[PDB]
């Protein structure tokens, strides 16, 4: 008399197949790429030109002496 089949309690689990967790698509990408890229170029011309100012300063001490 002690056999298995239970009265209730069932799901089931799915046979489904989906995980569309997107994801900033469709022209939202290529937008964070370009602006941060020119931001790095914007970081230039305030350092290389600044080091160029120090570069003439470095060559200044050479020319002032040597007579």
């Amino acid at each position: 008399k002690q056999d298995m089949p239970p009265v209730g309690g069932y799901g089931p689990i799915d046979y489904k197949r989906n995980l569309p967790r997107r994801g900033l698509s469709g022209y939202s990408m290529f937008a964070v790429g370009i602006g941060a890229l020119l931001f790095g170029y914007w970081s230039m011309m305030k350092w290389n030109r600044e080091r160029r100012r120090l570069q003439i300063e470095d060559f200044e001490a050479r020319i002032a002496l040597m007579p």
């Binding site: 030109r49 100012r53 003439i56 060559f59 200044e60 020319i63 040597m66």
Partner: protein
């Protein structure tokens, strides 16, 4: 030819991006006035020694004093 940019950018999207960097690179050095500031600096970098010359009568300009306003003005860069 209007879909020709939309039947290869959905077909081979690698060299299409190369030709756009082949473009926008040849054209722009002839466009913005930030160039020729590249030329004014790259000539005004003193390597060698500026040797003075001999006076005889003239004197058109530039006496012996270095801190006199007697030469050019490249001092815009320090103000820049």
């Amino acid at each position: 030819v209007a879909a020709f940019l939309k039947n290869v950018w959905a077909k081979e999207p690698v060299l299409v991006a190369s030709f756009a960097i082949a473009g926008l690179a040849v054209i722009l050095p002839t466009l913005s006035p930030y160039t020729k500031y590249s030329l004014m600096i790259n000539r005004a970098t003193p390597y060698n020694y500026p040797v003075p010359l001999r006076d005889d009568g003239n004197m058109p300009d530039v006496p012996s004093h270095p801190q006199d306003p007697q030469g050019p003005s490249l001092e815009w860069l320090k103000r820049l």
